[PDB]
Structures are given as C-alpha cells and as structure tokens.
RNA sequence: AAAUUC
RNA sequence: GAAGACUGGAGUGCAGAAGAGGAGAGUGGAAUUCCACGUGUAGCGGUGAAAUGCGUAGAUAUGUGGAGGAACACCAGUGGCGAAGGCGACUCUCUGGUCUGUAACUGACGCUGAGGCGCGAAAGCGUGGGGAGCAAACAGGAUUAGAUACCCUGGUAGUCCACGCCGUAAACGAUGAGUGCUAAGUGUUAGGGGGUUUCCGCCCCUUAGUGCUGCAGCUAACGCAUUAAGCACUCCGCCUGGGGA
C-alpha cells in the first residue's frame, strides 16, 4: 500500500490463490468495498464480510473453489497504473476473454463493471482485469 | 616553519626563508655585547690564507655561556633571541643571582621553563650535569673535551649525540657524524637536541643573498690559465688530463685522506664514520 | 560522572614519607574540581611482573565525583613527572 | 547535549503543556544539537564519519521547515525570529 | 557447560577480584576459549576486558 | 631441484 | 485544487541494551634489529645440492642493561559495528548511528532523486619528519641451451606520521533504493513476554539481525527460495553482434 492500495489489493488475492488458501483479510477502504462486492455479483468470490476496528476497520473475504479442486479466480491483471493512468471511451471498452472475463471500470455513476457501462454508453478509468 | 615566497620576479623565482615564529624578543641585552671586524681572510701578515671570504654585513657579538658552571641556583628563561653568528638561536637567561648570560636555545625550550645545572639537577632539557651523572643512552648536546674548558663538540643546529655507556674512567659517545668516541667523565653536556632544526632547508635562490652573509664568488679550475692552476689551460673545454683531480697545490682532492697518520688520539676513537 | 583511582607507591617508602604523598596525591584532587569520597590502601601486594627493578608495592584506591573533569587531566600530568608513583589507572563508573 | 539540557529547551516552545512533537518544538531541539556539533566539528576536521550525522540533521531540519511554510505561513514567519535563522 | 555466571549469581565484575579471576587463565597465562570454560557469550566480553585490564596493572602476569 | 617444441 | 477531520506511515517524548563505529591525547607487554659489558671457541648462516655472506680486530651461542620503529599472541566466533571503502593492546576527553519496550505528543510532515556537493582500499605525487623489519629498482651467488625470472645473501624509493593532491579496483552478494503479500525445519547475536519453577535450569510466544536444509513459484541450466533471482506498485542507472576501442 505504498503507493497503489488497488495494485496491492489485486496481489493479496492473486497469492493466496496461488497456494489454494481459503479465508484473507486486509484493510478497509470506500473503493475496496465494492470492488470486493462486483467479485461476489459473479461467484469469483463464496462471500465477504466486513470488520470495525479502531483505525479504519478491515474486510474479510471468502475465497471460493470449484469441486473437484479447480480455481476460480485464474488471474488479475491492472491497466490503470499510478504512474500511467488509462482512460477509455465508451466504444472502446474492451471485452476480456470474447465476454467469459470481466472488467472494472470507475465511471460517471459509480463504479462499474463493464457488462452495462457499454450498455448504459458512459466510459471512465479502467481499473482491473479479471479473468 | 619555512616561508614561501611567490613567483613575482625571476630573482624571487625560488627564494624561500624562515620566518621566525620562535623569536620573542628583538632587542639585545647591552651588557653582553662585544664589537667585531671582518678579516676577510685575510692572514696576520695581511695575506689572504682561506679564500672566498669577507664583504657581508656588519654584525656584532654577543657573549655566551659554554660552561655553565653556575651550579644549584635557579635560571629561568627570558627570551629566545637570534643571533647572526651561529645557525642556532639563543636564549636569555636571568637566574635569581641577578645575573643574566646566554645559553643555545635547545629543542623544546620556551620561555618560562626553569633551568638548573651541577650535580643535583635533573634530567630535563637545558639542565647541565657531568657526563659521570648522564644516564645512558640520553641524548645531550654541547660537549667538552676537557674537564672545565667549556662546551666545544655539539653546537651547530639541530644536532645531537648520544651518551652510549660508560667504561670506568671515561663514557663513550656517539657524535653526529657518526663516530663514537671516548672522552673523560668529569666533562660536562647539555640534555637535548639543539633547537633550530630547519636550518637546512632554505634556497638562498639568489647570489645578493649569498654575498649578504660574507661571502665571495668561486671560480672554477678549468677556466683557470696554465700558471694559476694545475687544471687551466687547453684550448675549448678540457676535461681532467691527469691522473687525478687535483687541489690549487697538488694534494689530490677527491678520495685522498688527510687525516695525520701518527695523531695522539688515535686509541681514543673506537671507529670512525 | 563517576570516577576511580588506583595508584601503586615504591615500597621503599618510610611509613612517614608514605603517608605524605597520600595527602599531596589526595590534594590536587580536591583542590580543583572533584571531591573524594574515601582513601584506603589495601597494602603491600607482590607483583605479577618487576614493573621495574622493583617487586613488591604499595595499592590504593580512591572514589570521585567531578564534573569539570579537569581534575583528573591535571592528576594525569603529576602522576608521570612524580617519580613516588610507578603506575596508575583511571576508570569510569 | 545532556537530557536536563533538552528539558531546559522544550519548557521554551511548547504550544501547551506537554506536546513533545510539534514542528516548532521538534525544530528548536534539532537547531541546538546542530549549532552545538558544529562548534564540535570544527576542531577535530578529520572526523569524516561523524560529520556525516550533521548532515542527516540539517536535511531534517530542513523537511520541517517546509511543513510550516506550507501549514501555517504566520507561525512560520514568527518562529524564525525567536529561533534566529535564516530563510 | 553451564555459565558459572549466569548461574551462581554473579553478575558485575570488579577488576580487583583477582582470586575470582584466575579460575578462567590458564596455566601459562592465556585465557581460556568458550567451549572449555562453558561461560556464557555476553559475559565473556565482560571477563575478556576485565582479564585485560587487570593484566596491566600487575595483578597477574602477561606470560606467567 | 628446474626440464622446451610438433 | 480548496476547506475540515483521523492515526497505522513517518518523527518526537519516556525506560533500557549491545557494539574492532569515529577524532585527539596519554599509556603497556612479548618479539625482530642495533649498541655496551661479562663467559666461552671455531665456526654461524643457507639450498634440491652449492656458493655469495658474516667470524681469530674473536663470531653463532649465552646473562645483564640501554635505544628506535611497526603491528597488537590467547580472548576469536559463516561473531559485532558502519552507507560503501573499512574498523582488534589499555585508559580518558569529544562525538555519530541502531535495536527493544511504552502510547505521552505532532498528524501524511513520505519515497525515489537527473545536474550539484561530499566520503572513497592499495599503488602514486608535493613539502617536511621518521626509518625496526619487510621490500619495486639494482649488485653479488646460483639454475639453465639462453634466465633481464622463480632459489640464496644484501638493498634505495616505499611501507609509518602532519598538511595538500590523485578519485581508481574482481570498489563482488558480480544481485539499485522503498513498501506489502506467499508452507516449514534448525543454529547463533541483542531484546521483551508467559509458563514450569523458592532459585538455578528447562518449555513456550514475539521483535530486529546473522547462517544452513528445503515446498509453492521462477529459471536456459547451474541455482534462488521470508536475508527471492517468487507475486505486485513508485522512482533512478544502464544494454542492443565480436573486433576497431
Ligand atoms: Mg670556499
Ligand atoms: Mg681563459
Ligand atoms: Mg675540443
Ligand atoms: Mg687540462
Ligand atoms: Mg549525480
Ligand atoms: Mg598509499
Ligand atoms: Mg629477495
Ligand atoms: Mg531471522
């Protein structure tokens, strides 16, 4: 969290993915919370929960696996980088893996996956990639 | 230390000098003053003997103490002076007699510093003792040769020798060229190195400044004609076309001891430098 | 600061001349600024090593409280001059 | 300097009575160690290593004086005279 | 092993206590290594200046 | 002891 | 961007710990060399063999004392400290940094950092001291077909100290600085905490260093592997076939 607490955040779940962990926890922050929610709109994430502490609270997330012990979250990637951020127009949304993949986007109106920013023909800031 | 001299001119090009820190006072003691005249090297019959000599600047002597016998009263440092017959300084000495005289300034000597003499005193610079009460392998100045006679083998600046051990009636001695000697116990020395050690590191860097201090051009033997020099003569340059170079009066010059080959005080000298 | 002193005295010393320069050695120390708290000697003591044509010695053992600490600079410079003392250490507390 | 020393200066500095880190209480232990160090540092020259912690000091002296100058542009200006630098 | 000193209590050092000194050098004079005498690591630093110190003013021998 | 070249 | 709020980052306070960190002055003991004096006789030294060398003006050896210089036996330990070069005898004076514990205080005061300024082994240079060993150059004896070398006996600059330059190295962990995350096992340095426990001693928890063995992962391979060469973010330096260079 040195500079990018996004960058660091998509990490923490990359790692423990890695090594097929179960529950991780981290601290809290207004654009973590929903970014932790879209991931549970799709399954990528079994459930999440949130913590009060005294500095800022933390949030707890649930990991989820497939049977048959398949990962579900096979990788993240970041497009919007502290020291080269990357805006989009509404057009040029890209779609990741032809649609199976899904994106982030920080539009007008809240943040956005990108399933209904093209659909509702606004653009912004592309946080993530998620595939 | 030694002050430089910037290059403003091609006389002043190299000259360097001292520059005196040491000296406190520059003012004389009027009683201890005695007048001289150049001789020039000129002989008693008028002739002149030792060449390349006379014509500098007039001096004045000045009276010191070679013996140092005033033994058990207290002395005491009043100055460090300089004085242009000798390449060490000299200081002035006030002892609670009342009587003033002057002793060589020995290295590390500074004003204030007390100094005693005889067979009581102890070993500190400036402090005379006979050779007998010396502790070996100190390091004295301003030996004597005969008991009483005064301070005759260890004077010129920063120069010392070595009490070396002692053999009954006599103590041997390391001089500063190097050759140990035997001499008598009851003579007397002065603990410490002389003071003005960077005497020898001067430029003189121009011929005024040499014939500021009494002295005379020298002339070159080759040069010379025939009847005037055992070199002269030959038309060019010629170098030495004898068997050896040779001195104004024969007696070769170069490798040739002349030292008296039947001397008394041959037993006296344990090896030579 | 704390300080210490532990100096040795030729034994050949007459118990009279021996208890002077106890007196002189203990004076400087008051004299500028420092205080002491005590001055004993433990005694005649063989040594380890003939420090010079000597053998055996004397021992002493002094405490200070000083500040200025000029006191034991001017105690270090008599202690060579003086020909009593043969070897002296300082330590800090 | 000494631990009674620095209690000396803080009682001089301090907003209210027992903040202990405020830039201008910070600033005005700092500028006394570095004036003492240097009087310390121009007898024995050769003491490259500790001269070395001088510098760390005055860069951190330094970094503090932009927090006022940027925060509270009169506290700044006003404690500047009372301490006796320089811009 | 076992540290005589961590163990039976005594925990400063005096450079007077020769007697107590001399159970840690050796026969000629030498001080003892740390896997012989079993002393902790902290306190051989400890004994190790005070030996020294003590060594110099004559209360044991530099060689013996 | 040292003791090269194809 | 403006205004305001918060304490984890960063820093101060408070209580402790360890340290060949540094500058200056003073001091110590073994040992090589030299000098003086006792005892004593023909050799001592050196190599693969030998010779040069030193010795009957009395050597080598041996006892006593004096002088000078340089480095610090044991402790000593993939131990400590420093940003890197580097730092071991002892004492004192003047100084720098680091770690643990507390939650008293400030409230983002942070990180990197082109040009700029400093420090930088050894050799080398200028002025001046000093000079015990060792030792470029060089001389002598050897070796060999030749031996400007390796071997042997000497030996100048130097090695050391003060002031001023040089600014380089396999200056190497051949690994830029900062931050977060990702199985274990076992040593060792300085700490804090608990259990057992009258103590001592044993067991457990934790912080910061320092070694080794090893998963997931990486790599071309060797190997790295919580002290990453793994997974990520910020800033800096550098590379684009070999030679010419
Ligand atoms: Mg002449
Ligand atoms: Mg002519
Ligand atoms: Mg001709
Ligand atoms: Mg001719
Ligand atoms: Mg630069
Ligand atoms: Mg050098
Ligand atoms: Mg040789
Ligand atoms: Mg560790």
Redesign the pocket.
């Known amino acids: ?4 607490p996004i ?2 955040f ?3 779940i ?3 993915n ?4 179960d529950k ?1 926890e ?4 207004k654009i973590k919370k929903e970014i932790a929610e879209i991931l549970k709109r799709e399954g990528f994430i079994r459930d999440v929960e949130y913590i009060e ?6 949030i707890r997330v649930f990991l989820k696996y497939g049977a048959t012990g398949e990962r579900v979250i096979t ?4 497009i919007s ?4 951020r990357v805006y989009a127009k509404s057009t040029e949304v890209p779609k990741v893996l032809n649609g199976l993949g899904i994106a982030i986007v920080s539009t007008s109106q809240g943040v956005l996956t990108d399933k209904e920013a093209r659909a509702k023909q606004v653009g912004g800031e592309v946080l993530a990639y998620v595939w | ?2 002050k ?1 001299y910037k290059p403003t001119t091609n006389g002043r090009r190299h000259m360097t000098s001292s520059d005196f820190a040491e000296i406190t006072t520059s003012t004389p003691e009027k009683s201890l003053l005695r007048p001289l005249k150049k001789k020039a090297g000129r002989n008693n019959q008028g002739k002149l003997t030792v060449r390349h000599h006379g014509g500098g600047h007039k001096r004045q002597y000045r009276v010191i103490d070679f013996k140092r016998n005033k033994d058990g009263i207290p002395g005491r440092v009043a100055t460090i002076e300089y004085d242009p017959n000798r390449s060490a300084n000299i200081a002035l000495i006030n002892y609670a007699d009342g009587e003033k005289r002057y002793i060589i300034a020995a290295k590390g000597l500074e004003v204030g510093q007390t100094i005693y003499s005889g067979a009581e005193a102890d070993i500190k610079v400036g402090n005379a003792l006979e050779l007998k009460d010396i ?5 004295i100045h301003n030996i004597e040769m005969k008991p009483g006679k005064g301070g005759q083998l260890v004077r010129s600046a ?1 120069t010392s020798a ?6 009954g009636k006599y103590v ?1 001695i ?1 001089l500063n060229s190097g050759e ?1 000697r035997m001499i008598l116990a009851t003579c007397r020395a002065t603990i410490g190195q002389v003071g003005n ?2 005497h ?2 001067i430029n003189i860097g121009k011929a005024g400044r040499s014939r500021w201090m009494g002295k005379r051009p020298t002339v070159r033997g080759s040069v010379m004609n025939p009847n005037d020099h055992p070199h002269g003569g030959g038309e060019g340059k010629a170098p030495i076309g004898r068997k050896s170079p040779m001195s104004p009066w024969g007696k070769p010059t170069l490798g040739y001891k002349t030292r008296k080959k039947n001397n008394n005080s041959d037993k006296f000298i ?2 030579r430098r | ?1 704390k ?1 210490e002193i532990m100096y040795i005295i030729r034994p050949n010393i007459e118990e009279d001349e021996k208890k002077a320069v106890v007196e002189r050695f203990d004076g400087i120390l008051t004299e500028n600024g420092a205080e002491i708290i005590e001055s004993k000697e433990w005694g005649k003591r063989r040594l380890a ?5 000597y053998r055996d010695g004397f021992y002493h053992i002094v405490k200070l409280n000083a500040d200025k ?1 000029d006191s ?2 001017e105690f ?1 410079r008599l ?2 001059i003086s020909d009593d003392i043969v ?1 002296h ?5 | ?1 000494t ?1 009674e020393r ?2 000396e200066i ?1 009682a001089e500095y ?3 009575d ?6 201008e ?2 600033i005005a ?2 500028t006394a ?1 570095i004036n ?2 240097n009087e ?2 121009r ?15 005055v ?2 002296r330094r ?2 004086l ?2 006022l100058r ?2 509270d542009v009169q506290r700044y200006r006003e404690l500047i005279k009372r301490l006796g630098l320089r811009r | ?3 005589y000193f ?4 005594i925990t400063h050092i005096d450079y007077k206590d020769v007697e107590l000194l001399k159970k840690f ?2 026969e ?8 012989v005498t079993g002393t ?3 306190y ?6 005070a ?3 003590s ?2 003013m004559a209360l044991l021998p ?2 013996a």
């Open positions: 969290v040195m500079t990018d960058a660091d998509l990490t923490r990359r790692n423990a890695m090594v097929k962990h991780l981290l601290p809290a922050s502490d005294d500095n800022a609270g933390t990788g993240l990637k970041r980088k502290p020291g080269l | 230390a030694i430089k502790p070996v392998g100190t390091v920063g070595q009490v070396l051990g002692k053999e041997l390391r140990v050690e960077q020898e590191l344990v090896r | 600061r300080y090593y003939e420090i010079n044509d600490a034991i600079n270090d202690a060579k070897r250490m300082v330590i800090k507390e | 300097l631990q620095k209690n803080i301090r907003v209210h027992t903040d202990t880190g405020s830039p209480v910070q232990v700092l160690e003492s160090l310390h540092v007898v024995h020259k050769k003491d490259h290593h500790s001269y070395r912690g001088l510098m760390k000091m860069g951190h970094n503090l932009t927090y940027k925060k | 092993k076992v540290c961590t163990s039976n209590g050098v050796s000629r004079g030498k001080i003892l290594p740390r896997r902790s690591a902290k051989q630093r400890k004994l190790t200046v030996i020294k110190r060594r110099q530099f060689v």
